[PDB]
Write a protein that binds this ligand. Sequence first.
Ligand SMILES: Nc1ncnc2c1ncn2[C@@H]1O[C@H](COP(=O)(O)OP(=O)(O)OP(=O)(O)O)[C@@H](O)[C@H]1O
Ligand SMILES: [Mg+2]
Ligand SMILES: [Mg+2]
Ligand SMILES: [Mg+2]
Ligand SMILES: [Mg+2]
Ligand SMILES: [Mg+2]
Ligand SMILES: [Mg+2]
Ligand SMILES: [Mg+2]
Ligand SMILES: [Mg+2]
Ligand SMILES: [Mg+2]
Ligand SMILES: [Zn+2]
Lengths: 104, 154, 613, 373, 165, 35, 50
Amino acid sequence: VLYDSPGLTLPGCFAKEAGLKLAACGIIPTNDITLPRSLVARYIYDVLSAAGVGEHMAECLHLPRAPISFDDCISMICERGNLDPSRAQKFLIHDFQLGNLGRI
Amino acid sequence: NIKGGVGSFLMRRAAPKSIRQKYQTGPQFYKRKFFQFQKGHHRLHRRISGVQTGSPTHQREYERFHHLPGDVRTRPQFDFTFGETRADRVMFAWRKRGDLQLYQMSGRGETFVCYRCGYPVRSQLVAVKADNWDYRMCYRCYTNTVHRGMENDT
Amino acid sequence: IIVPQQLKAYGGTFSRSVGERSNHLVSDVVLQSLSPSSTHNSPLLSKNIKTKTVTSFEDMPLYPELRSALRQLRITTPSPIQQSAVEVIMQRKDTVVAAPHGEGKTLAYLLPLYQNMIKDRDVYKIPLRERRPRMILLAPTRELIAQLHHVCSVLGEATGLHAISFTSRKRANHRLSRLLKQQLVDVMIMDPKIVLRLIRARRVFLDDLRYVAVDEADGMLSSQHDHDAVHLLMKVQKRVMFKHLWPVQTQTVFATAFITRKLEFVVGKKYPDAVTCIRRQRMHRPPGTLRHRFLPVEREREKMDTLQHLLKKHGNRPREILTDIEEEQAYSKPHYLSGSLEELVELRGDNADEMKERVRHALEGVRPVHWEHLTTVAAPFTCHVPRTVFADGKRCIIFTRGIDCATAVYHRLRGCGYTCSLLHAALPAAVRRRMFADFASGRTNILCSTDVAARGLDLHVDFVVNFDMPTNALTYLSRAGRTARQGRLGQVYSLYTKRQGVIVSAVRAFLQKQLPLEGISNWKRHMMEPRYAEWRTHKLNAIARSYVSLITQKTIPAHLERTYLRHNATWRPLFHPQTTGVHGGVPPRQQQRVMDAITWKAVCFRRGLLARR
Amino acid sequence: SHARYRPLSLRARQTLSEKSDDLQYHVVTQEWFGERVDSFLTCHYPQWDYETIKRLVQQGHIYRYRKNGKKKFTRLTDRLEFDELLVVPTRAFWEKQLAPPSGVLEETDGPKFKLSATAREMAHNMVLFKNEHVIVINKPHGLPMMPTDDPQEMSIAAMLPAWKFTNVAKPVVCHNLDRETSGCVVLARTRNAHRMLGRMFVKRVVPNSVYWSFCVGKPTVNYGRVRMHFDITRGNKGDIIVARPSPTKTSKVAIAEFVVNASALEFGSFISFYPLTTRRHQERIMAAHALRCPVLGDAKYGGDAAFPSSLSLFWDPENKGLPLHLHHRKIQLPYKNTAGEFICVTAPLPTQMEKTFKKLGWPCEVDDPLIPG
Amino acid sequence: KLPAGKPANKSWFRHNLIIRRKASYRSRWGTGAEGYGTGVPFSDQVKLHCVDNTNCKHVRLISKATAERFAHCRVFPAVAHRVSVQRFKVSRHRVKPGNIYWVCLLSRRQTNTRMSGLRTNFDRNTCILMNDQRVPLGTRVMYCAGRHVNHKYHLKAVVLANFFV
Amino acid sequence: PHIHKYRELNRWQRQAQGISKWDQSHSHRPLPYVE
Amino acid sequence: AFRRLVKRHKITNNQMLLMRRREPYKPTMKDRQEIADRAKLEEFERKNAD
RNA sequence: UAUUUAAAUAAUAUUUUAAAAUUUAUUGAACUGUAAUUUUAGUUUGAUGUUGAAAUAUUUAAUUAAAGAUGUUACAGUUGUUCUAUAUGUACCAAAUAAAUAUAGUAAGAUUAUUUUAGUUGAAUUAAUAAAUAAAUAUUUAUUUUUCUUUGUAAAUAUUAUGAACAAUUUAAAAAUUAAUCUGUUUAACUAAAAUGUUAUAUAUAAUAAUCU
RNA sequence: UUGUUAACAACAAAUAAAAUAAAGUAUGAAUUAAUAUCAAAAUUUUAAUAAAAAUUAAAAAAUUAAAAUAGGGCAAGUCCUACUCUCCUUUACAAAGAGAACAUUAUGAUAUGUAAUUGUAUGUUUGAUUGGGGCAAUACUAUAUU
RNA sequence: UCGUCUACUUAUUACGUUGGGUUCGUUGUAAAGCAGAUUUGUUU
Ligand SMILES: Nc1ncnc2c1ncn2[C@@H]1O[C@H](COP(=O)(O)OP(=O)(O)OP(=O)(O)O)[C@@H](O)[C@H]1O
Ligand SMILES: [Mg+2]
Ligand SMILES: [Mg+2]
Ligand SMILES: [Mg+2]
Ligand SMILES: [Mg+2]
Ligand SMILES: [Mg+2]
Ligand SMILES: [Mg+2]
Ligand SMILES: [Mg+2]
Ligand SMILES: [Mg+2]
Ligand SMILES: [Mg+2]
Ligand SMILES: [Zn+2]
């Protein structure tokens, strides 16, 4: 038999880094007022480009070149067009969630 | 499991929850179970009324209650009829008898609850305790309180 | 299309009891109301009522012989009933001694009646003749007659008056006539049926009869005892009307634990000037030291298993039965307990008398009775069989329904290994005396009895078990009124099923709110349907409370003021509350107007829906 | 220490009164036959206050016996009858598990706190409204209403002896606020005034106070009602508050009517709360979770969300120490003015709230008409 | 419905922010060409261009009323709706979306009739970003400033602007 | 006396619940048994 | 259960308009019930004297 | 067993309309339902018309499904649309038509005719063995007994459900005004006469004033 | 102001110009109808809106348009408690339209039973005084015993 | 009656690292206090 503990484990009022990690993994929703797609995609780009993974990120996202900056990466994702930088950030977030960027 | 049936009217005898409510040893601060109204009244509130016989020139407004004993047979200390009309339409105010002061309202009698008797009273005479308009008294309880000398206690 | 009547004022039904609650029942089942709003029309309780009291026995006039009788009975402070009733009876007035169970109601009328006989014997010097007694006592049962004879013998030993009693025996007509021929008596403690037989047989005459005491008068004056007391009192009344013998004003005293319609009307109509001594704030309620416990049994068969648990819980331990000889001896050999005060106080855990009373209080669980500015300890039980055996266990009486259930439970407990004694009327005279003497002396701590042991028995009963839930509160109070006597601790266990769930929920509720068990029955429709004027009273109070809550906490606009006061602050009468269950409390002419509008709008909406489907 | 008192129903209290023998029976002789009960008791107990005697008589602890077999509860104005008894409880009667009224036992003040000149000056400065019965002060942000777990911290309960201008006893706080909430606080000057004003701070149906708040984000509705059910459980070093939409037996309701007065587009809003209940952190919880808009600076509910980067030109979102943008603005009183209207005391907005209002272009000092006078 | 006795309007604070005009026959807004005082002010949620050399491109107005007649006595807060993206990287570049600055209004597309009778219809709605001290974040202005800009309330704006009409 | 179950319900309660008058218990129509 | 339709009487004196009770010298209902009970009891006692 | 005294032998009647499911016998598939044969529409809901050109037309939005039309056959209420449910079986589905004083412990509404000619206006209330007696209301009817005046006493018949919870007091009176102790209310020949009541007093333990410690 | 697309949708402000729907000549219903040639307003009060009373006051006639009042049906809405109905279950209660088995003539058919102890739908399943007491042959006058 | 409480302690050193153990309080009240609701426009 199993007993469930309803309010024992819960993020609640989290920290900045914890909230970024939860939104990047999809645990918490992305709030357009407090926790922006821009900030979480900046966090994803930073944690990816920490090491020499820029060319691999470009290969995963089908980019013609290795991105130098987060804005350049978002613009290239838009070019790969009619979509907006908001849609590009959403695509990057969803790719990181599905694992199209690699195991991390 | 086993179910039985007992009417609530059999338990109504135990409605009061204290000595003050069961034996009426003090003021009923909005906690009264049994009420006594005149046989035939449908709107259950007591009525302290006045008789109007003339215009404000000949008969003053406080002279309507002259048939009642007490302070209504004296002229008040304060008069608010002249000048800006009061927001609550208080026309007169008698002298403070301890912690109680008697006022006279204008217009139809406002239905309030006297904290001493516990009844809803519709009258123009309101006695305010310690200038706090949450605790009001009908004129009958006001006259009785002054008669016994409990003006500074209740 | 079908649309019910929407507008309603009251959907239930009102009882047809116009007089008071439970007007359809007989007085033998239901208790009468003691509120002044109800007793205002009663022929007995609307009249003079004695409520003043006398503090001490020294403040009331008593002869030295009565002073010694009280010291012998170890009684110092009078109980509230004795503080009020002793003075009225000494004034030679027809008195209704009304008091709960175990408050000194017996001595309340025995002291003044005995003193009046002493005054007639010494001051007035009225001679005592052969077949003309002075006082006649009336009791329902045989054990109560023997108990009343015990108390009158303690008083008669000091006062010098001779009391006589008689129950049914073999060759009773012979033995009763010899008593009337051999010894002179002035107190006759007998049954009203038998004393009526002696009067018609001309063995006892109503001459110089000055006092008639009726114990348990609520039942004696009812049809449960064939109106034998009522027929006797009418013969006594015509004796007073007789003006050719010496003027005797025979005063009549009624000792009652209950007040019913029979008692009120038979005394209020026949005794116009009758003083009633009663405290209505304590009359129809159990004692304060009584603990009630209602144990529900899911199956009727499992009732015996629950009873055996209560016996083991209170020390009564059955002997083991493991062999065939012990199984046969369980029903053949009547087993008896053995012990004494010395061994019992060692088991539980001048100076000689103080220690005997200290142990007596610890065993009987005697607590100091608390009256206003007066506290006392309960006197020893006035039973004609003194307890001489003291075994380890709590004493109990198991009240059952009918004789067969009492007999059956008696044999079931014996087969289980319990020392019990059976008591009912079908038993022969020799066995009936032996069975009661076994329990009252201490050889047996379990009494399986019928309702015969429910009225007037002052025994050491630690707790009472209602094996069958009583059908009314009158029997419930009388059964439970055996274990708590004069402030002693008592406990009651009532085993009930679904068939008595209505009265159990009623009694359990009345006890928790500390209310009198008046108007309680087992009919669910009777306990749920109120009277119209009583519903009107509680409705008016509920409306006024909603008005107070509406004024003091709610602010209402002008357009909503009319409807708020219409639904929360207006008393709206009903239309013909007798036929409320038909028209819902609304005039059918108004209902017709309401139904016409709703039906028209319902038909128009239906025609559209049918056309769309 | 009152640690031996127990909850008692009316039945148990009557049973204890019957059992306990700690009673004195004054015999009404010819010399006192005909006197009033209050007069008799005042002459026989000089150490008791009239309030104590009144409470005893009206609650029924003191009664009388007229030799009828029952106790008689009376009013202070009833006359005594000849040869009756007056039953009064003694000192030992209150040593059992039955608590007496407040006037029976005698409390000891003991220590007396010392307030400095600057403390008294700021206490006098915080005064907004003064009356013969009430004093409304402007409690600021960050000042505790009561002494906290750390006894070294200042508090309004410790500054209280500074508002007894001419009275003999210090006032009594009628309602407490959070450490971060700033606004109007009511202090009754008289004991009777406190007893009468306590009725005003229990759960009600019509609101009599306003809370002005600046919340992060604009809710989907301009006005409405919020109703939650809070259950408080003891934690390690705090209280676990469980908010439910459905009532539970161990829960208590929190109700408040909110109106969004003005707001930014979707980044900030100015909201007026009108509560009907008194629950811990009621406004903050109802803003953070019911309205989904955390109050600006409310780090306890929505910590990272309470410091938005949208106001980074005005407030630096990195310090995370800016005061809570929740202010007890306006409160109505039962006392009327000379014009005949109920006196409504208003507190000015704090520095941070005025700064935010001025940066967003909103008027700071505006009368809220939803609470009449 | 507050108050419970006499319910009132819940837009009491909005009335202190909006500049309204009852649409009777004597009181009308009309088009800006009718004369002086006939242009409808900018409501909230209105998009304006940002012509200073800042990272921002479009702003959304927060003010309930915005016009040239009272551009000298009223403060206009706005939120950066759209921000230019620099693929290859100071205070003017640090403009992030969602931030709130004040805006100095430069021109409007609606007709504006001066007191001299000169009507004007500019190409697009225009404004520049400023802080709480009314100091522009940008260093240059890529549009024309209106005559109402010539006021001491916009000292630094006039200094940074290079063309007026 | 009576043996039916709805006898505790008055006419108003019966018509409010929607129950047919139990006093007019008609038996000329058989029960819908599974033939 | 008394007559709701009040009986009318020819008014010969103007005080009959004021009087509510027909026979004011007659005892009330319960009083005359008690009087009848007492008188019948006394008659019964006289009959049973012998 | 039979010791006690009368009489005008005549029977047939007993408001009214309704208050509800029904009993006996038939009918109905031109409406509608299913099977065999010879951009449309349904559902939800808001929005116009509100006795409307319609006793059901038009429109908004969402959602679900899309070979289109007509007629004729078989299935009829105890139930039919071949499981059940909803819905429906010809303009209010307890279907429609024909008979019923069938009957509702019976809810309520009406009930035809002035000038009149006599008693009570809140009592009574005991299920069940030898106890004098229920009371109110109405109709007929019966008792000339003392006295200083006054005094509606009793039978034979008809009906009776108008519905109160606490507290205080009481062998005497709520006299506790936070208490009521309750049956309202209508009732009038004419002309005259006639005895009845609401006024306020604003300063005496008060008010108006000065010296000085 | 929000989307499609390389003009379309609603909206909020100038909701503004501009289009169609008149008296009057004719014909001519229906809901409704206690009623004085109806009574502006204010105040006080009386058994639920009171248009009912009283006191102050002073309220024109005709035509058009307005939902402020009257009028047009309303013991209602939310919460808690208790009882019941409904609905499910079978192992016991009464009926059950289904079937069996048995007796009788035949080992081949139609039926009658006094034989039916089977089952499924339906009715019911909380008024216990139908109890408990008392009465207990041997009268009367006497005798003995424990 | 809208109080407050993610850190102390047994040691270790250095100018933070490593092993163990884990609430306080103001006021009122003794009921005049304690769950939930406190809504009503024939605008049909
Ligand atoms: N004044 C007294 N003080 C102490 N004990 C008393 C007093 N009066 C009587 N008792 C005791 O109370 C016991 C019960 O008395 P009593 O038989 O009168 O009760 P009761 O009311 O007749 O009970 P029931 O109605 O059940 O017969 C007696 O045994 C007696 O010893
Ligand atoms: Mg007894
Ligand atoms: Mg720019
Ligand atoms: Mg067809
Ligand atoms: Mg079918
Ligand atoms: Mg008569
Ligand atoms: Mg008679
Ligand atoms: Mg079956
Ligand atoms: Mg069944
Ligand atoms: Mg509450
Ligand atoms: Zn009062």
